């Protein structure tokens, strides 16, 4: 897991930045080949050191995951700051991509969201809860290959429980959270299925922000009234129904990823045939 700073070459341009720190493109010398990487670099100035604890927690979750539809961690490095070195997904965030590529066809969107469900079906099987499943966290390798990223809120489920109980409401992506998450702080894989429904809405809306113009509290209020976001323009009716199914209010009656993935798989096969 611990990498050699001499084997890592960084570019000066930041691909992204924020409260987490910055993200940079780089290269890492492997056994023979050189590997293009995305490196999450900690702010350092704003130490905390909560940032360092969550970066190693994120690294610990990533090290346990092995699936084609999940971003692979190369390793961690302690140098100028703590660094999380990941295999680069060249095209970046799905919402950013689709906002700049409105010519992407519905069949291609179905192909990409299906790949996200396959990775989520694997995460569910591994008893990991994602807790930040959103279009911004789906990264594209190519226009036909999506991977799930950002395990900063992820939790390994206890052997005796189906969900993770948070104690306090943190800095949460509320618009992607199921009612049980907001109301009882309970996160299960079915909670991630709810987030998956929102991600699907985002993808078929070409990376549009969900619940536009609304506060999280107004979203919670809307969801309680049994109201849901409308069908995106050009979105197949079968995809919208799958979105509404992911948005089943009661966690007990919501499908799991194996059911969600199967529905997506069969519909993709139908779309491929013409």
């Amino acid at each position: 897991v611990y990498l050699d700073r001499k084997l890592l070459t960084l570019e000066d341009k930041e691909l992204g930045s924020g409260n987490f720190g910055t993200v940079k493109k780089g290269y890492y010398q492997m056994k023979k080949v050189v590997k293009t990487v995305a490196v999450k670099i900690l702010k350092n100035e704003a130490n905390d050191p909560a940032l360092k604890d969550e970066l190693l927690a994120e690294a610990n979750v990533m090290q346990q995951l092995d699936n084609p539809y999940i971003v692979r961690m190369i390793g961690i490095c302690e140098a100028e700051s703590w660094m999380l070195v990941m295999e680069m997904a060249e095209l970046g965030p799905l919402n950013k991509y689709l906002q700049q590529n409105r010519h992407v066809k519905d069949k291609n969107i179905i192909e990409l969201v299906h790949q996200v469900s396959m990775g989520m079906k694997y995460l569910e099987e591994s008893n990991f809860v994602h807790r930040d499943l959103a279009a911004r966290n789906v990264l594209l390798v190519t226009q036909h290959y999506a991977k799930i990223s950002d395990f900063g809120l992820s939790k390994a489920l206890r052997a005796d429980e189906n969900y993770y109980k948070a104690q306090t409401h943190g800095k949460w992506p509320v618009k992607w959270y199921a009612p049980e998450c907001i109301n009882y702080y309970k996160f299960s894989s079915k909670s991630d299925v709810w987030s998956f429904g929102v991600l699907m809405w985002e993808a078929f809306s070409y990376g549009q922000k969900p619940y536009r113009g609304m506060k999280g509290s107004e979203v919670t209020a809307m969801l309680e009234k049994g109201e849901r976001m409308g069908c995106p323009a050009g979105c197949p009716r079968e995809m919208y129904d799958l979105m509404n199914l992911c948005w089943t209010y009661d966690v007990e009656n919501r499908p799991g990823f194996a059911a969600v993935e199967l529905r997506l798989r069969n519909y993709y096969y139908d779309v491929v045939n013409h």
Partner: peptide, 5 residues
């Protein structure tokens, strides 16, 4: 806008 406390 995205992460709310």
């Amino acid at each position: 806008e995205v992460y709310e406390s």
